[PDB]
């Protein structure tokens, strides 16, 4: 009976909540109450990457920490040499509604997707000296909101059809599909070991998936509205979410519950992007009020502001050695901060 | 810098030039978002994404029909939103009004003007002439409504006034709605879109030039 199934589901929810409550002894703030304050964090715009003629939806850093790819709604992917601000590549797109982009760890490929429901893989290393689309991954029934390369032949995409998928670019087939979200999945983040990933959807919950197996391991709730950003802690045992209730939250996989809340009274706009520092001590979040805030992740005290964008900050990344922060925005400008 | 860095910078400058020409070519087109509904006949207005292109008076228009709180944010830089309403069916009129209110009051669509096409006026005229269906049942205020065939005229004016009240209840002039009456056989909808977009761009220029 439907009523009996609902009763069993709510009983299990109560049991899980009680287990989480029992497992909680002291909040993260109490533990990190004696930690020395991080102090004011001042970053100045080292580089301003100009050339996009429309709002920027996504950016991704290369593993070399020097090359980055940016996606813009004018149907162009631009690969920047951030040291010299030289445009290495400019990739025309079949659809100009791109809302995500990725850079392969090897650096041979970039990916993008959007309202066309397709992830396109582009080969940067061709014998013809030209960038060409390698594979087009079709099968998602909603807009692609994120994509992350696992290796040169495996990619994970989160779509607007409330599903996340793992692809095999060699054959262009969905190897496994991750289901369970009841809202549009907006972003995903891969663990350092690339065995698990976390995805945040429009149902105000994040889920931890097993790439090899293909089912959700844990579900994390606590946000009051749609989750727009997510990113792993550098050690892979935690992650931070950025949502539309003007709040960032930190979750621990082992504790399977919330850890700390990153909110302020005069912040009412939603968070569009979230990223950690190299050591995980600083959390950087992009907001709709045109600014980026730096949060002391251990103490939930704001450490700085990356003011300098005149529109919504849509993307935000940190290099693999932590030497810079690149924030793109809806004013068609990218900035490198240090 | 070195010789290779000089050549790399020259290639970057060539890329910059090509991007500038592409943007100059793409800035002369006007992008529109078609946001009707099923039974509204929005497809038969101008003679994944159902993109349709038309040109009047040597001005190019690009219309995007996606086939919602998240993907609607991509269309915040469009020239205007073309909202098509089936005015003959009173049952779905309130749903159309709610949809129009949601689009109008959105945070990222708060500066976009809406070209409202009240489609299928001929069917509405036939329905009001028949008298079988009364607008007063669905909309009580139509019973005590008098216009500023007279019955068809007051029905049309009440239907348009509902949407106009929704549009003027907020905005403070940052964007306005351009109501129109369409019979799904009228061939002047492209001209109406062009004139309304020209007025929208004129008002935008007046705003950005510190003249308004």
């Amino acid at each position, epitope marked *: 009976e439907l009523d009996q199934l609902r009763q069993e589901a709510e009983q299990l929810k109560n049991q899980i909540r009680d287990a989480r409550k029992a497992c909680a002894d002291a909040t993260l703030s109490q533990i990190t109450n004696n930690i020395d304050p991080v102090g004011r964090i001042q970053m100045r715009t080292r580089r301003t990457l100009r050339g996009h003629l429309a709002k920027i939806y996504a950016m991704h850093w290369g593993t070399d920490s020097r090359l980055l790819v940016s996606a813009s709604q004018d149907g162009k992917l631009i690969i920047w040499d951030s040291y010299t601000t030289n445009k290495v590549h400019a990739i025309p797109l079949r659809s100009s509604w791109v809302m995500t982009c990725a850079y392969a760890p090897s650096g041979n490929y970039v990916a993008c997707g959007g309202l066309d429901n397709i992830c396109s893989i582009y080969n940067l290393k061709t014998r013809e000296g030209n960038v060409r689309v390698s594979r087009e991954l079709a099968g998602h029934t909603g807009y692609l909101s994120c994509c992350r390369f696992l290796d040169d032949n495996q990619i994970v995409t989160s779509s607007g059809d409330t599903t996340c998928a793992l692809w095999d670019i060699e054959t262009g087939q969905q190897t496994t599909t991750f289901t369970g979200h009841t809202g549009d999945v907006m972003s995903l983040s891969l663990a350092p070991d690339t065995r698990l990933f976390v995805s945040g959807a429009c149902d105000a919950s994040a889920k931890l998936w097993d790439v090899r197996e293909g089912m959700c391991r844990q579900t994390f709730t606590g946000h009051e509205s749609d989750i727009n950003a997510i990113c792993f802690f550098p050690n892979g045992n935690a992650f931070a979410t950025g949502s539309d209730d003007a709040t960032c939250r930190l979750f621990d996989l082992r504790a399977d519950q919330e850890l700390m809340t990153y909110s302020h009274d005069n912040i009412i706009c939603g968070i569009t992007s979230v990223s950690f520092s190299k050591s995980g001590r600083l959390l950087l979040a992009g907001y709709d009020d045109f600014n980026c805030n730096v949060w002391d992740a251990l103490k939930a005290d704001r450490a700085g502001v990356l003011a300098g964008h005149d529109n919504r900050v849509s993307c935000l990344g940190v290099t693999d050695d932590g030497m810079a922060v690149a924030t793109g925005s809806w004013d068609s400008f990218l900035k490198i901060w240090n | 810098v070195s010789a290779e860095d000089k050549a790399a910078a020259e290639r970057s400058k060539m890329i910059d030039k090509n991007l500038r020409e592409d943007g100059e070519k793409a800035r002369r087109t006007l992008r529109l978002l078609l946001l009707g509904a099923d039974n509204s006949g929005k497809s038969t207005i101008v003679k994944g994404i159902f993109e349709t292109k038309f040109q009047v008076d040597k001005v190019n228009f690009h219309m995007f029909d996606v086939g919602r709180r998240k993907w609607i944010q991509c269309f915040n830089d469009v020239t205007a939103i073309i909202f098509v309403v089936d005015s003959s069916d009173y049952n779905r009129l309130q749903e159309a009004l709610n949809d129009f*209110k949601s689009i109008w009051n959105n945070r990222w669509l708060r500066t976009i003007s809406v070209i409202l096409f009240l489609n299928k006026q001929d069917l509405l005229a036939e329905k009001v002439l028949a008298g079988k269906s009364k607008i007063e049942d669905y909309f009580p205020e139509f019973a005590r409504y008098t216009t500023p065939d007279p019955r068809v005229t007051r029905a049309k004016y009440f239907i348009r006034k509902e949407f106009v009240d929704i549009s003027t209840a907020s905005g403070d002039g940052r964007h306005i709605c351009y109501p129109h009456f369409t019979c799904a056989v009228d061939t002047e909808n492209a001209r109406r879109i062009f004139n309304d977009c020209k007025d929208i761009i004129l008002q935008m220029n007046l705003r950005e030039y510190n003249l308004v």
Partner: nanobody
Framework: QVQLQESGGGLVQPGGSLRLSCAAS????????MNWVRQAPGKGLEWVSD????????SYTGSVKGRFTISRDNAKNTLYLQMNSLKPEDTAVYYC?????????????????????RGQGTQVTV
């Protein structure tokens, strides 16, 4: 966790009265604009009424204007819909729907098929 539990529905003769309650938890009730949504048997979701963050702005659909009264208590996190003179066409399952984002007036997707911030619903029949 965002939860909306509806109660107060039941069977009533035509011309009778009812009162529906929507106890809310998992989110701060004050910053959100609440709605009332119903699904008639064999029909899709329909928006019935809504109330702003403080209760200043209140709207209803024309079908139920003058018969239903919406109100909220931000202290008790409860949403109400007083019903007067029920009609045979008013029978439906009544959902309590929350606006997707706080501090905002527009409410997208409230009447969607699989909206995430809607209640299970209560059945009101005459």
């Amino acid at each position: 966790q965002v939860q909306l539990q509806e109660s107060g529905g039941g069977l009533v003769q035509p011309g009778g009265s009812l009162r529906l309650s929507c106890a809310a938890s998992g989110f701060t009730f004050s910053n959100y604009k609440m709605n009332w949504v119903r699904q008639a048997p064999g029909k899709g979701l329909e928006w019935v009424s809504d109330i702003s963050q403080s209760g200043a702005s209140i709207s209803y659909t024309g079908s139920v204007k003058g018969r239903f009264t919406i109100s909220r208590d931000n202290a008790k996190n409860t949403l109400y819909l007083q019903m007067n003179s029920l009609k045979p066409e008013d029978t439906a399952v009544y959902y309590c729907a929350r606006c997707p984002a706080p501090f905002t007036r527009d409410c997208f997707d409230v009447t969607s098929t699989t909206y995430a911030y809607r209640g299970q619903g209560t059945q009101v029949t005459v």
